[PDB]
Amino acid sequence: GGAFGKLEAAREEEYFYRKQKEQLERLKNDQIHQAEFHHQQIKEHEEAIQRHKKFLENLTK
């Protein structure tokens, strides 16, 4: 498709969700403890916000 367009946006969401599902499984199998899980998930959601701002600023002007 195009840069920062609908197909790229979908691909980024798919990558993000695949990663987070893998982390949820590490938690369910006691490979990471829960405090660590929540601390790492905050950083992921912070990076997701920056990614969405980036897409937005390219879409809008």
Added chain:
Amino acid sequence: GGAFGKLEAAREEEYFYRKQKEQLERLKNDQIHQAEFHHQQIKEHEEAIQRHKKFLENLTK
């Protein structure tokens, strides 16, 4: 299990990711435009950060 424990954490992630897959589908089917998608997704990730902070606070001290 227990409140704020591993099973509840998993349930919160499952709910969050089911909602986001629904929103991604709305975008794929041009029911929301892309700027709106990214703007709404920032709010969702902001709410997820607050949720993860709340779980952490209960886990730790």
